Ligand binder design. Structure first.
Ligand code: RBB
Length: 167
């Protein structure tokens, strides 16, 4: 039993809710919140900008030190950093950004990072400003992630479309 509330069950291990991931993280304080990161961990907008804003820019300060030490992530890769006031840990995952021309096949590699964590609160990777089709992202999630994932979808219209079209 866990503290996630109000989710629709899609499969054995995937759950979905119309929610603001920042507010959901603030209430649940999950072990892991996933950020929709880029390779530079520049958290300017979308999910990343909102998560970083909620940490009062502490996420960005920590991320800048990470990059200065380690260099950029790979598209499809991830790193574990602090969850600050939102979660124990933040798993920064880089899905391909279609608006930069990155290969959508890398979306499966991106979701594979979730399998290193037993339970996660997450957005749909490569959705929103990353330019991928969220219905496709949900399909890849369900077919790739085997651990327990709680997906927060900010847009109510999109949430209803994802549910109604789910196979
Ligand atoms: C993850 C998606 C697919 C969907 N959107 C969200 N996802 C998770 N929580 C969210 N709360 C919100 C509040 C207001 C507007 C959007 C959201 C939102 C953001 C979009 C931008 C991005 O690319 O990050 O991507």
């Amino acid at each position: 039993v866990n503290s996630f509330s109000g989710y629709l069950k899609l499969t054995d291990n995937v759950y979905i809710k119309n929610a603001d991931i920042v507010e959901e993280a603030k209430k649940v304080k999950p072990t892991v919140v996933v950020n929709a990161a880029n390779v530079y961990l520049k958290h300017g907008g979308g999910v990343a900008g909102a998560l970083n804003k909620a940490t009062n820019n502490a996420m960005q300060v920590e991320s800048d030190d990470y990059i200065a030490t380690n260099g950029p992530l790979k598209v499809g890769g991830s790193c574990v950093l602090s969850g600050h006031n939102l979660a124990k840990h933040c798993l920064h995952v880089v899905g391909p950004n279609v608006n930069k021309g990155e290969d959508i096949q890398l979306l499966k590699s991106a979701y594979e990072n979730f399998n290193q964590h037993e339970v996660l609160l997450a957005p749909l990777l490569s959705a929103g400003i990353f330019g991928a089709d969220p219905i496709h992202s949900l399909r890849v999630c369900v077919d790739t992630v085997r651990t327990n994932v709680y997906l927060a979808v900010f847009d109510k219209n999109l949430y209803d479309k994802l549910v109604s079209s789910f196979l």
